Amino acid sequence: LKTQQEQTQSQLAFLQRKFSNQALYNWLRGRLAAIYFQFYDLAVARCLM
Amino acid sequence: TQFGSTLQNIIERQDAEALNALLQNQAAELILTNLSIQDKTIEELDAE
């Protein structure tokens, strides 16, 4: 059981040390969302043109 | 942008593979512990 406990924790460590962690997606989302909204305003303006 | 999304997929896969490797390694550790348990289980029956 202690062995399983350590294994569970090493997986938690993995989920933070791996590059593709929640921090990556949080960053990518925030950044892309800013781009997407800005792109949108421009796309609309041209549709209107 | 295509190199970008391509790299992103590579990274996600690189990590997914590292995870499967981790999980199989762990499985071996538990099996070994379980073998020690089965050995004691037999000794118990021999004691009976």
Rounded (5°) CA angle B7-B23-B18 = 20
Q: How was this structure determined?
A: cryo-EM
Of A10, A11, A20, the CB nearest to B15: A20
Question: If 0-12 CB within 10 Å is exposed, 13-18 middle and 19+ buried, where does residue B19 land?
Answer: middle
| Resolution of the structure, angstroms | 3.4
Chain A CB contacts of B12 under 8 Å are 20
Chain-chain contact of A10 with B19 (C-beta, under 8 angstroms): no
DSSP 8-state code for residue A20: S
- H or E, element range at A28: helix A22-48
How many Å apart are CA B22 and CA B17, to the nearest integer? 9
